[PDB]
Amino acid sequence: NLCPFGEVFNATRFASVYAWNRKRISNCVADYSVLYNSASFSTFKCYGVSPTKLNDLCFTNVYADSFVIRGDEVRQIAPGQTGKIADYNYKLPDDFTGCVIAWNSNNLDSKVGGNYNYLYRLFRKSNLKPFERDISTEIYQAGSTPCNGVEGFNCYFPLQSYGFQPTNGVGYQPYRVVVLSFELLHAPATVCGP
């Protein structure tokens, strides 16, 4: 059967970037040209591989990570980037094999007066390692005195909501992002091209 990309790409709601979702894709035929030929994606950039070669390759499994960020942050979903998303939310490795796919989701994820459902992590003492995921919510100690779980001065909740309103400039509008990565083990290959 064809790989169920629609479950990922056409999901009703996406994950917040700090709690980004990973879906394993196995035991199916993947026609990657249905994706890269599409006029719907404003970003489709592959690293370590060419998109027109994907259909010729067999993998043990394929993985789809998905989340929502602001338009101006899509450039951080790339090897070697820095910033709040790359540093504290979703980190690709410096040498990456995979594809980054993104599209404007203003019509789905913004709301008159504001959609605040989507969050990102603002405060974190150190950068994420590649493919690390941090969903902790400890009060962030920004001063010399410990917080003991109490918000207050210099003691901050680490997550912050995006403010997605339809009148936002494009760089402040929500973008849905799918990162495809590929896995090759000494195991049967279960996702092949057509």
Place this chain on the structure above:
Amino acid sequence: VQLVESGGGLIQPGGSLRLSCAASEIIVSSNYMSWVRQAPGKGLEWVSVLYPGGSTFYADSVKGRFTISRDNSRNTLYLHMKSPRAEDTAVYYCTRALWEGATFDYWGQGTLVTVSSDIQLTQSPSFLSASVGDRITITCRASQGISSYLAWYQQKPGKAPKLLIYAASTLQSGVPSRFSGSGSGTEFTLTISSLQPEDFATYYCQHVNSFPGPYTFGQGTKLEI
């Protein structure tokens, strides 16, 4: 509780300079820490920021010439000015950024450095003369919708800017209630309901954004008697 700059001075070109900013109670390495500068008679310019995790970002006017760093054991932020030019002459403020990692709630007193020889924000009016008790409005307009990512500052002569309002309408703790902010998207207004004599100052709006860009601050409004 405080940020204290040092290391400024008057230098001839062709050298190097290092500013330092020693913090208390604020922990430098846990915060979005920045340098903001102000040339004599001009507006504010965000120069560089150092993230808690160590990423650094610089305005295009100083990229390649300035470096920001920190010493965790001395709880100190530094600005290393390599090849300083006359156009770097300014008062240099150390700041901590809180809301969205770009709203500056604490400022050092600033240190003077003299060197011998994309969304745009428009603030109106540039000059505003009024009397005590007047109701005054200052408006900030952005070239694209920026939701509520805006803050307002008051700068008295000789002093560091002071945060009044952030998230467009949220009044900073300790600011009198006659100050209020309104608007969203592309138009934001600072209202002072009943002008008092201590309110005569220069006011700045700021598009609250994660990186030091050239249009971070409005050009300012000089409020005069």
